[PDB]
Design a protein around this ligand. Structure first.
Ligand code: SF4
Ligand code: SF4
Ligand code: SF4
Ligand code: SF4
Ligand code: SF4
Ligand code: FES
Ligand code: FES
Lengths: 32, 111, 105, 711, 253, 332, 188, 220
């Protein structure tokens, strides 16, 4: 019954992606 | 005699151990699921003219459900009266419970 | 008629002690094997052989006894397994292509 | 190759690459086990198979230890003894003291191997208590007492690998690990009842066989399943005149330790709507009668009609044994009739395959042939519904080899991947000459399975010459010395036996004659057009169903559990059922009903002992004398004359191949009378995971309970 | 073995971080230089976590076979309360057995010396406890740790890690008779070598060390309990008056 | 199958079930605890007194003395209270079982047997007042039913039929079983092989069995009365209701039973009517493959023709009673 | 033919035709002074060509010793009677004959000893059923006791099927004296 | 009171829809390419964490979506999410307080018991529940790998370490105030001077300038 950190809308971000998943985007096996 | 718990439920859960160990094949048991889902007997017959009064049936019980009361005075007229069905064996336990509980209380340490 | 056979292992358990000896038993008849007792509901019988079974070490020992006593006999040949090497290592074989199975221990 | 090794001194000869527990079995050495099953993947969880191996500091798990060329195994050393007691002490520390209330009592591996390899007493007395877990709703058939789970993983391995139904799992960790679907779901698999037999303990029991019997009180009969065409080998456990349960017995040639749910639970349908006395329809109401004056009114009606040639018709049902086919074949012949129909639609007309060569209608690459199949084309068959245990064997080969499956027919929900080529005959001609054809042409041991459901398709003559003409074009691959890629799959236990004795309509001429008299011999799935309304109908059977509803006479026969009938399975193996009980009421053995009505119609069939009637069967087909074996077909190439020569000009109509099994649960009269199959259908439809769905037990909406089972 | 059938059934090797991370340097500096440090079979430097009852707990890398005494009061500010106020050291982490004061006096921290002392270096997570701490409570919190980390796949760990955890909470209170201590010794011997993985020894070794070096402690707590309730408890934690009070008491416990 | 042995010689119940237990225990390869050994040797001699009270007093009731019968059946009536306290049966106890005894004796019984013991000799002495020196009794048993020592052996005679012809032989002394090697007792052996010798040998055994019972009371050790192994003997009720292994062993013992290793044994004891033996073939399973009972009276009645030949019918009624004959023993 | 020893029991296995010589030697030898027959019985093994094993148990009061003698018989193959040596063996052989059908050549008055007078069958044979084939009752209409085919109000429930799927005794232990084992060849 | 079976809920039922956001699938794609193409079932662990960081906890619908992305039977995903503790199968607070109660923290510095005591009295809740305003769900955990920095309590993805009864209270309060202004969020790591794990009374080792590649074997 107490409120919980549950996403309300389908396009809501309840918790931040954080650093580790953020750096995954920058990954590219092709050398620059 | 067939006994109950303090609640009133029958102690017998139809394991059939007393039927397996009977030296004279005097016990016939048919069980199924009761309306509430409990494991209980539908038939419980003891041929008092096959039984040898060994007491094995009550040594094998895991719930003290079948006992032998101290009653030795029950000569009858017809031997049809000596085919105890589950309605008579429960009626016997209701009748004899204080004395059954007392004999169990005395002998339980040795059992 | 009597049936000479080697009892099959129970599906319920993995002990095979009772599959080791041949059993000779009598076939049930269409009438007289079991009827309901009108009084107590017990099962009455006329089959004097219903609870009798014989054990023999070999099939030919049972056949010899059956012919010695004049029984009619049907012999049932045992069903045996087919050996197949089983390897714990296969549980983790590598699939180059589509998995087509997700092994779950 | 063969490695050699010593176990307890004695040399055993086991193939290289097999596990030690397999060589211990071959060497005559009993090794305690719980997790290891011969037909399931190796799991090393139980630790009850720990043996002592030379040059190994720890005990090894024998079940997962491969055999090596020179190892020494001591299975009775003091290392082994204290290993087994220690495991038996752990397996019993949290086990519920529920042996009097457990259904596995008296047949439990935990009990027996505790008596043989454990200590006599226990050392667990914790005030903190034992583990206890909640029960799980996994469908109607299986009752769960999960406190008893010893975590062997046998059922998750069976359901995931053999049944192809991956809904059972193991959620949690450590002592709180639990077996069951995380969200309550109804285990949807026609093989799911095998989990109950596989369970070493009673944590998975059967709701029908809930608390009715103890294993010691059951008479065990080794008989045959007749609820499908595969002839599965079973054990019928009965207490007096009532069959209690039906278990699977090993036969690696047929069913391999597995039975389907229909053959395991339909036995409660053997005590519900049985015909127990003769019936005569008088003024539109069925009256009881004796045998002497029900067989009389059979004869009087027959004399009144005075039927001409082929006006007396027989329709044989799908549970009919071969003895009564041969007897009814004779009595039919002495009456001038060759009108010998079969239950299915199209069964009152001649069949597209003949019955002249045995290989025309058989599963020729025997059931064991799948174990080496490389490519398989399924035509007009949903094998998961028509032959459940066979379907599993296909998946076992598929999961371990490069097997390619293609199907022409109605798409079904398959436990193995398959290519769908089409639904009609053109989609077979286009497939057999298409990409998948070269798979059959290239792959050694190819296999074409033709469902008995195409025999009733109108285009079967075109279907059957399409298939065999491909087989004849592609021999030395389909038709080698020991292989035949042509296979017709029966779904009723009576079809192969009828074909073997020639119990079919011979010609189109006899097919068009209207009968004045129909003997429905256990026939209940007859099409209405195959019984003229005004005819005289005799029904001989054991269950009151459609057939008895229309009968003018009803004659009660025997069910397969109280006769020793001969049956032929789809592969051509001739097996014998063993009576487990006697006849109920005034019922009579089926072949004897025919033999008696021979006296009343004045043409007594010669034999009057069943030994004599088996001598007659030997004259029709000698393979019927060979028991528990398939007799190979010699003139296997002669099959072209029925399949292709007599099927040359076929009037193709283009109608698509039809499903044959609308309800896997309701296929025969025994099934339809079964309360358990009633619950299996209703639970399937409404998706109910509750064990007490139409059963005794307390519910949220039944605080009080219920005594109805099946409703 | 995973060198053949490992990850996705492919040949694989699993190696710890610190072992992998030191490979590039030993290549560029030379394995002889690595083998300079340590004893004959205990070469190299190694990273020590010095946690617990020392004044300044931290982690520092040091040569293998450093004496335990030489390490804590030189790289960590000393044990709290002084050397004489030490009680016991868990040398290699929760898995390795506890080591008392008089064994840890002249003990070298390597693979061989610790194995000789019926213990191990593990990952050298040196947990050091004071003389003013409940040692038995410390080990019961580990057997509680091992109860929660077991996968549950095999019998001797899925059942045994809970059974020993329930026993350890009793010995914490003293709710037992001293014969239970022997029963707990051979329960653990029933666990080692019978499990699929080495998490079985991981919870058997700590208990075995505690019985091996602190059995006077446990029996004292039982005696303190046996004084308070009026008699030696039954094996299992039930009080001596249990049958008198009408409870299930089998002959023997 | 153990209750079948109570009903063989139905006046000597706990020694019938002793020979079946000793036979099964020998194939089981087990040693039964000391307390049950003494319980069994005490109740085997209480049984021997019970049988001799039937045999001697019924013999004299046939011969026409009717008063000693009634006096000693009160002694019999008192000694069956001890049967009904250890078990709940006045006749068929089923008390002696393979592995010891079914239940421990109650906590005041060894005092009550000692109180009975203090006066039982006076009962023998008064029974002996009526028969031993009585000339009518003497002149109806002297020279009656005389068997030579050589013929008693050749006729398969055991017990007092063997011992009354001057052969010193008791199975208890020659193949000791239970706690008999731990007790001091004598063996009465007759001279003239007649009914008077066999009466005097039986009365002496009254006094010898009483002398054993008193010794058993003073050597009664403590400990289990049942073999301490639940794969053979049933666990206590309290264990079965509390421990997993105990309920499993309880369940399997009352449904399947214990397996006996394969083999055969012939086991004999010194039963009150002679030597009683059983031949048990075991098949390694839970049921006996073959049980054969050797009954002392069966061999005695077979030699009745050789012994009563030439005697009077009033002599033959005396020969029937001197041979300890219960026909449920003879016909099995 | 052979001899076995189990614990304190020595058994001798003899040819059926040797019955008179063997028992004479065991009766009248000064080192074999076995002058009692304790018991003669049979055991039935239908898996053998000779069904019946004849077991004799003998006692020597002189040497405080026991010996068991075993021979074999068949449905038609007779055994010598030993009532020429032991008068006590007479009724025992009547029992073996009455209960098994074995026939004892030389016996005076080999008649039934246990069964009823017109009884047909040998009850200790393993093919004989437990409740027999016939039952009796008093017929009021015939004024006598008559003999009828057997019907049982309750059929006998045979609980043999509840025997453990697992062997429970094992192979045992060999315990032969080294004086009766073959010497082993020492290496080199 | 963690359960290993699914309890049907208005916030946890299969009928509620889940889908990864039009931004997450980019993270999904990169994760998938890091494994063999047929062994995409290796990605179940990363996507369960991605699913529960978008929704709040590993719901039955979340788990079911991850099953269809990786062509798995959903029961294969239930066993994973039930095995691994970091997945939350029941809704949690905004801040999931994880206090380590294993022996090293129980002895390290001040014991963890005061730290649990401080949390309990300040948060007004017992083990395993959430606060009535639904911001803090407090549980105890096994060793978290910061033993030389005992006692330590991690909250969401950060380790507030070397804690005392006074310091853990203010670390929690500023975290409560962080729901509005991110400027007041407490810094991670340990308090009381230590940076990560160094000696608290001066550096015992690593004082001189580091040695570079100059000391390398010449043959290489
Ligand atoms: S009375 Fe006892 S032994 Fe008999 S069936 Fe009921 S519970 Fe079982
Ligand atoms: S006392 Fe009677 S009913 Fe009970 S087991 Fe014995 S014979 Fe059967
Ligand atoms: S599963 Fe076996 S051991 Fe467990 S309670 Fe049932 S019968 Fe007893
Ligand atoms: S439910 Fe039965 S088969 Fe499945 S893991 Fe548990 S014990 Fe094994
Ligand atoms: S020892 Fe290892 S494999 Fe076995 S249960 Fe414990 S963690 Fe699992
Ligand atoms: S049998 Fe090998 S571990 Fe279960
Ligand atoms: S003990 Fe808390 S971090 Fe290791």
């Amino acid at each position: 019954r107490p409120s919980f950190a549950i996403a309300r809308s389908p396009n809501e971000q309840v918790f931040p992606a954080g650093a580790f998943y953020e750096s995954i985007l920058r990954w590219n096996p092709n050398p620059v | 005699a067939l006994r109950r718990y303090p609640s009133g439920e029958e102690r017998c859960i139809a394991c059939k151990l007393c039927e397996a160990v009977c030296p004279a094949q005097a016990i016939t048991i048919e069980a199924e699921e009761r309306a509430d889902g409990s494991r209980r007997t539908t038939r419980y017959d003891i041929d008092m003219t096959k039984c040898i009064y060994c007491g094995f049936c009550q040594e094998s019980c895991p719930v003290d459900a079948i006992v032998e009361s101290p009653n030795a005075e029950y000569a009858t007229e017809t031997r049809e009266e000596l085919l105890y069905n589950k309605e008579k064996l429960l009626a016997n336990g209701d009748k004899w419970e204080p004395e059954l509980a007392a004999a169990i209380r005395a002998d339980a340490p040795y059992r | 008629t009597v049936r000479i056979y080697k009892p099959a292992k129970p599906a319920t358990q993995s002990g095979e002690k009772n599959t080791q000896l041949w059993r000779m038993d009598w076939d049930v008849l269409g009438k007289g094997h079991r009827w309901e007792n009108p009084l107590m509901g017990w099962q009455s019988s006329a089959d004097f052989m219903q609870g009798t079974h014989l054990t023999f070490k070999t099939k030919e020992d049972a056949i010899a006894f059956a012919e010695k006593q004049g029984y009619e006999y049907f012999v049932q040949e045992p069903n045996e397994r087919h050996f197949r090497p089983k390897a714990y290592a296969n549980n983790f074989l590598y699939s180059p292509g589509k998995l087509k199975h997700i092994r779950t221990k | 190759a063969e490695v050699e090794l010593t176990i307890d001194g004695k040399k055993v000869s086991i193939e290289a690459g097999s596990a030690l527990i397999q060589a211990c079995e071959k060497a005559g050495v009993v090794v305690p086990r719980y997790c290891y099953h011969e037909k399931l993947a190796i799991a090393g969880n139980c630790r009850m198979c720990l043996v002592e191996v030379e040059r190994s500091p720890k005990p090894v798990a024998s079940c997962a230890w491969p055999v090596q060329a020179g190892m020494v195994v001591k299975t009775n050393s003091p290392l082994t003894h204290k290993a087994r007691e220690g495991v038996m002490e752990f397996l019993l520390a949290n086990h519920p003291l529920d042996c009097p209330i457990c259904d596995q009592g008296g047949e439990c591996d935990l009990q027996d191997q505790s008596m043989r390899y454990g200590a006599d007493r226990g050392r667990f007395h914790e005030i903190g208590g034992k583990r206890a877990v909640e029960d799980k709703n996994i469908g109607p058939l299986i009752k769960t007492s999960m406190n008893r789970c010893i975590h062997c993983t046998r059922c998750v391995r069976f359901m995931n690998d053999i049944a192809g139904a991956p809904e059972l799992g193991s959620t949690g960790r450590g002592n709180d690990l639990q077996i069951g679907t995380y969200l309550e779901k109804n285990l949807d698999s026609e093989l799911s009842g095998n989990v109950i037999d596989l369970c070493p303990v009673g944590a998975l029991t059967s709701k029908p066989y809930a608390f009715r019997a103890r294993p010691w009180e059951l008479k065990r009969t080794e008989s045959i399943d007749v609820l499908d065409g595969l002839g599965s080998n079973i054990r019928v456990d009965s207490r007096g005149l009532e069959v209690m349960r039906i278990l699977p017995r090993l036969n690696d040639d047929v069913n391999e330790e597995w039975i389907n749910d229909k053959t395991r639970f339909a036995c409660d349908g053997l005590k519900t709507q049985r015909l127990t006395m003769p019936l005569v329809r008088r003024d539109g109401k069925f009256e009881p009668a004796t045998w002497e004056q029900a067989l009389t009114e059979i004869a009087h009606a027959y004399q009144t009609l005075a039927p001409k040639e082929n006006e007396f018709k027989v329709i044989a049902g799908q549970l009919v044994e071969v003895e009564s086919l041969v007897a009814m074949k004779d009595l039919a012949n002495r009456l001038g009739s060759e009108n010998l129909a079969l239950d299915f639609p199209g069964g009152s007309q001649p069949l597209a395959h003949g019955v002249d060569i045995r290989s025309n209608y058989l599963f020729n690459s025997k059931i064991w042939g799948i174990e080496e199949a490389d490519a398989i084309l399924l035509v007009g068959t949903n094998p998961r519904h028509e032959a459940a245990v066979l379907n599993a064997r296909i998946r076992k080969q598929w999961l371990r080899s490069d097997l390619e499956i293609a199907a022409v027919g109605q798409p079904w929900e398959s436990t193995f991947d398959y290519e769908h080529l089409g639904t009609d005959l053109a989609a077979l001609k286009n497939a057999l000459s298409g990409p998948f054809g070269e798979k059959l042409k290239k792959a050694k041991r190819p296999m074409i399975i033709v469902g008995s459901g195409v025999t009733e398709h109108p285009d079967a003559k075109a279907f059957y010459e399409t298939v065999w003409s491909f087989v004849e074009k592609n021999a030395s691959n389909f038709l080698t010395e020991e292989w035949c890629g042509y296979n017709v799959l029966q779904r009723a236990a009576s079809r192969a036996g009828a074909f073997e004795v020639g119990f079919v309509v011979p010609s189109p001429e006899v097919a068009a004659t209207k009968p004045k008299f129909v003997w429905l011999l256990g026939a209940d799935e007859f099409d209405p057009a195959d019984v003229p309304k005004d005819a005289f109908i005799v029904y001989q059977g054991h269950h009151g169903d459609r057939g008895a509803e229309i009968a003018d006479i009803v004659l009660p026969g025997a069910a397969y559990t109280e006769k020793a009938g001969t049956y032929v399975n789809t592969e051509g193996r001739v097996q014998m059922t063993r009576a487990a009980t006697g006849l109920p009421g005034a019922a009579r053995t089926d072949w004897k009903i025919i033999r008696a009505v021979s006296e009343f119609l004045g043409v007594p069939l010669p034999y009057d002992d069943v030994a004599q009637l088996r001598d007659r069967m030997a004259e029709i087909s000698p393979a019927l004398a060979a028991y528990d074996v398939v007799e190979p077909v010699a003139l296997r190439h002669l099959s072209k004359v029925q399949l292709v020569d007599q099927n040359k000009g076929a009037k193709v109509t283009g109608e698509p191949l039809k499903k044959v099994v609308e309800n896997f649960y309701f296929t025969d009269v025994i099934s339809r009378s079964s309360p358990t199959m009633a619950r299996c259908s209703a639970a399937k439809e409404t998706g109910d995971p509750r064990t007490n769905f139409m059963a005794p037990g307390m519910e949220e909406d039944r605080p009080m309970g219920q005594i109805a089972y099946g409703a | 073995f995973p060198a053949a059938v490992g990850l996705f059934g492919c040949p694989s090797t699993v190696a710890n971080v610190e072992t992998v991370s030191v490979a590039p340097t030993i290549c560029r500096r030379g394995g002889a230089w690595f083998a300079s440090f340590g004893r004959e079979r205990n070469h190299g430097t190694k990273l020590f976590c010095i946690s617990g009852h020392v004044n300044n707990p931290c982690t520092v890398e040091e040569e293998m076979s450093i004496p335990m005494r030489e390490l804590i009061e030189k790289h960590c500010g000393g044990v709290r309360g002084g050397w004489d106020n030490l009680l016991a050291v868990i040398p290699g982490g929760s898995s390795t057995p506890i080591l008392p004061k008089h064994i840890c006096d002249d003990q070298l921290m390597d693979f061989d010396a610790l194995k000789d002392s019926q213990s191990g270096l593990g990952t050298a997570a040196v947990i050091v406890m004071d003389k003013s701490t409940d040692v038995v409570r410390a080990i019961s919190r580990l057997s509680h740790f091992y109860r929660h980390e077991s996968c549950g796949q095999c019998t001797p760990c899925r059942e045994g890690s809970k059974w020993t955890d329930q026993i350890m909470k009793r010995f914490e209170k003293g709710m037992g008779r001293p014969r239970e201590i022997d029963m707990l010794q051979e329960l653990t011997k029933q666990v080692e070598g019978h499990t699929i993985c080495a998490l079985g020894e991981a919870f058997a070794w700590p208990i075995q060390g505690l019985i091996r070096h602190f059995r006077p402690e446990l029996e004292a707590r039982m005696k303190k309990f046996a004084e308070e309730t009026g008699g030696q408890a039954l094996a299992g934690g039930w009080t001596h008056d249990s049958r008198q009070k009408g409870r299930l008491v089998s002959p023997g416990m | 199958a153990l209750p079948y042995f109570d009903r063989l010689d139905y006046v000597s119940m706990m020694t019938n079930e002793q020979v079946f237990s000793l036979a099964v225990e020998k194939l089981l390869n087990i040693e039964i605890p000391p307390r049950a050994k003494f319980i069994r040797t005490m109740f085997g001699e209480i049984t021997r007194i019970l049988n001799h009270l039937m045999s001697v007093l019924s013999h004299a009731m046939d011969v026409g003395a009717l008063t000693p019968f009634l006096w000693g059946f009160e002694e019999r009536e008192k000694l069956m209270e001890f049967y009904e306290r250890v078990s709940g049966a006045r006749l068929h106890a089923a008390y002696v079982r393979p592995g010891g005894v079914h239940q421990d004796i109650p906590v005041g019984l060894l005092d009550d047997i000692y109180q009975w013991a203090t006066q039982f000799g006076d009962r023998i002495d008064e029974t002996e007042e009526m028969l031993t020196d009585n000339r009518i009794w003497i002149n109806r048993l002297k020279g009656v039913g005389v068997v030579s020592a050589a013929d008693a052996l050749n006729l398969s005679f055991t017990g007092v039929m063997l011992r009354g012809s001057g052969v010193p032989w008791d199975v208890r002394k020659s193949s000791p079983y239970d706690a008999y090697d731990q007790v001091e007792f004598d063996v009465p052996v007759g001279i003239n092989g007649d009914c008077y010798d066999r009466y005097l040998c039986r009365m002496e055994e009254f006094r010898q069995s009483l002398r054993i019972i008193h010794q058993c009371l003073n050597k009664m050790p403590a400990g289990p009365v049942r073999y301490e192994d639940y794969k053979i003997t049933p666990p206590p009720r309290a264990a079965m209701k509390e421990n997993m292994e105990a309920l499993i062993h309880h369940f399997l013992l009352f449904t399947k039973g214990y397996a006996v290793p394969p083999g055969d044994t012939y086991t004999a004891i010194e039963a009150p009517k002679g030597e009683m033996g059983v031949y048990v073939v075991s098949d390694g399973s839970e049921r006996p493959y073959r049980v054969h009972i050797r009954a002392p009276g069966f061999a005695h009645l077979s030699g009745f023709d050789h012994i009563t030949r030439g005697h009077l019918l009033a002599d033959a009624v005396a020969v029937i009673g001197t041979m300890d004959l219960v026909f449920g023993e003879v016909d099995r | 033919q052979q001899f076995s020893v189990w614990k304190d029991e020595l058994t001798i296995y003899i040819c059926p035709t040797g019955v008179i010589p063997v028992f004479s030697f065991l009766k009248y030898n000064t080192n074999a002074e076995f002058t009692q027959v304790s018991d003669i019985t049979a055991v039935d093994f239908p898996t053998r060509e000779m069904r019946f094993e004849i077991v004799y148990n003998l006692l020597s009061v002189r040497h405080n010793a026991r010996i068991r003698v075993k021979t074999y018989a068949d449905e038609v193959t007779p055994v010598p009677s030993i009532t020429s040596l032991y008068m006590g063996a007479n009724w025992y052989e009547r029992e073996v004959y009455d209960m098994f059908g074995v026939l004892f050549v030389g016996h005076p008055d080999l008649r039934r000893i246990m069964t009823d007078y017109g009884f047909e069958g040998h009850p200790l044979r393993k093919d004989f059923p437990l409740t027999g084939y016939t039952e009796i009752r008093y017929d009021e209409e015939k004024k006598r006791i008559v003999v009828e085919p057997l019907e049982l109000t309750q059929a006998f429930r045979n609980f043999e099927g509840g025997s453990s799927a697992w062997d429970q005794v094992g192979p045992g232990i060999d315990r032969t004296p080294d004086t009766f084992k073959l010497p082993t060849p020492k290496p080199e | 009171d963690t359960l290993m079976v699914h309890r049907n809920t208005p916030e946890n039922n299969p009928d509620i829809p889940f889908k990864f956001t039009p931004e997450n699938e980019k993270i999904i794609e990169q994760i998938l390419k890091r494994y063999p193409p047929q062994y995409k079932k290796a990605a179940v662990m990363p996507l369960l964490d991605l699913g529960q960081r978008q929704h709040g906890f590993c719901s039955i619908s979340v788990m079911n979506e991850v099953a269809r992305i990786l062509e798995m039977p959903p029961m294969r995903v239930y066993e994973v999410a039930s095995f691994y503790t970091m997945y939350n199968r029941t809704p949690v607070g905004k801040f999931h307080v994880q206090a380590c109660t294993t022996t090293p923290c129980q002895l390290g510095g001040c014991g963890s018991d005061a730290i649990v005591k401080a949390i309990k009295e300040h948060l007004g809740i017992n083990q395993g529940e959430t606060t009535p305003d639904g911001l803090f769900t407090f549980i105890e955990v096994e060793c978290l790998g910061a033993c030389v920095n005992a006692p330590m309590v991690q909250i969401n993805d950060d380790y507030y370490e070397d804690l005392t009864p006074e310091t853990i209270k203010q670390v929690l309060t500023a975290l409560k105030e962080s729901v509005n202004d991110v400027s007041k969020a407490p810094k991670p790591g340990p308090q009381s001077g230590r940076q990560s794990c160094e000696n608290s009374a001066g550096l015992t080792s690593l004082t001189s300038e580091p040695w570079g590649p100059e000391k390398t074997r010449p043959d290489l």
